Each structure stands twice: as C-alpha cells, then as structure tokens.
C-alpha cells in the first residue's frame, strides 16, 4: 500500500544480533525473572490504576447499602397509637 521495507527510514551504524529459534529455549528463565518483572510492572501502575477502581467499590458498598435501608421500613408509627 505504497509503504514497505526499503524506504521506511534511514538507519545508520546499528548492528543487530539474533539467534535461530531452534538454538534457544522458548521459555528461558520464566519464573526466575518473569515473576520479579511482573511485580515491578504492577508497582509502576498500581498507583494510577487501583485508586480509581477502589473508589468504585466504595460507591458499590455504600450505594447498595443505602438502597436496602430505603426498602427497610422505619419506626414512624407514632401519632396514631391505639
């Protein structure tokens, strides 16, 4: 579509190395460094992700609590008596 490898950009003085997929393990150090990585990733975002959704649960735990209280009858039987 008028754009393909060959004219994308001008790259100079960059050397890359790579291995054959058959000469390297597909799952290298999965839990050795992947698990410590996810802890690093989660911390970097838990201060921007959790607080917005923590508030929603607070709305949930209060909006639903008040709704049942409305359906619950209140002791307003005075002024009629026997």
């Amino acid at each position: 579509m008028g754009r393909q490898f060959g004219h994308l950009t001008r790259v100079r003085h960059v050397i890359t190395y790579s291995l054959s997929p058959f000469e390297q393990r597909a799952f290298p150090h999965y839990f050795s460094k992947g698990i410590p990585n996810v802890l690093r990733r989660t911390r970097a975002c838990i201060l921007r992700v959790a607080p917005p959704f923590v508030a929603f649960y607070l709305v949930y735990t209060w909006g639903t609590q008040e709704f049942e209280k409305s359906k619950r009858k209140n002791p307003a039987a005075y002024e009629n008596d026997r």
């Binding site: 001008r10 100079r12 003085h13 190395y17 790579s18 291995l19 054959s20 058959f22 000469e23």
Partner: protein, 49 residues
C-alpha cells in the same frame, strides 16, 4: 613444482631444514577442538553505503 628434480629438493631440505625441531615440550604438536556452527543473523544496517 616446476623443472626441479625431487631428489634435489629433498637434499636441499635436508641441508637447511634439518635444524628444525619437533616435539618441543609436553605440548608437542597441539590438537584442534571442534567448533560448533550456530544458526544466527548479523545485520550491520548502514544506509550510506
């Protein structure tokens, strides 16, 4: 190779290369070790050339 007799070349080597020595020490004649081929790919991308 050329217009030379093999006897002359052997005698000439005997005269000059006899001083050469072999089996110097415990190393003597060192032996090679196999080198493993490694499927890979190196790309030095330089657009100037």
């Amino acid at each position: 190779a050329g217009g030379l007799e093999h006897r002359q070349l052997l005698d000439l080597a005997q005269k000059h290369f006899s001083g050469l020595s072999g089996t110097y020490d415990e190393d003597a004649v060192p032996t090679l070790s196999p080198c493993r081929f490694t499927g890979s790919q190196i790309c030095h991308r330089e657009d100037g050339l």
